[PDB]
């Protein structure tokens, strides 16, 4: 009751996108990759249960699930979109997960490729002992 | 509908 605790964890969301030399048979012009990771020398898997990447409905199996690192999707397409990302926690109490609406933008042909990084800080106020242990390992 | 787009914009 004397002591209080705030634990902060750093997530990095990002994507790369490059125009293909030749478009696919379906007419997909771009190759892209989206990811969620920790900083260098981090182990976010200690507290991350899974990452869910909600692709545009035009993709087959659009709710892409990554239970183990790396948390990323590699795809080909013709356009960018808002891509909701859910990071689930190895946590018994709330919050169970966090959601980000990720802007998976693609540049036009004749323009340089995309290499974007978006930093996200999470704060857990007075987590459970077990979750605190998990968070601080990352 | 018509969510998929090219360029950053904004």
Author numbering:
A (entry chain A): 1 to 138
B (entry chain C): 5 to 14
The authors write:
We determined the crystal structures of AF9-YEATS complexed with the K5/K8- (1.95 Å resolution) and K8/K12- (2.00 Å resolution) diacetylated H4 peptides. The crystal forms of AF9-YEATS in complex with K5/K8- and K8/K12-diacetylated peptides both belonged to the space group P1, and each asymmetric unit contained two AF9-YEATS molecules (molecules A and B). Molecule A in complex with the H4K5ac/K8ac peptide (chain A) and molecules A and B in complex with two H4K8ac/K12ac peptides (chains A and B) recognized H4K8ac at the aromatic cage. The positively charged R61 and R64 residues of molecule B hydrogen bonded with chain A in both complexes. The electron density of H4K5ac was detected in the H4K5ac/K8ac peptide complex structure, but the position of the side chain of unmodified H4K5 in the H4K8ac/K12ac peptide complex could not be determined because of low electron density. Therefore, the mode of primary binding to K8ac and secondary binding to K5ac or K12ac by the AF9-YEATS domain provides a unique molecular basis for sensing the hyperacetylation of H4 in the nucleus.
Another Kac-binding domain, the YEATS domain, consists of approximately 130 residues and forms an antiparallel β-sheet structure that can recognize and bind Kac and some acylated lysines. Human YEATS domains bind to the acetylated N-terminal tail of histone H3; however, their Kac-binding preferences at the level of the nucleosome are unknown.
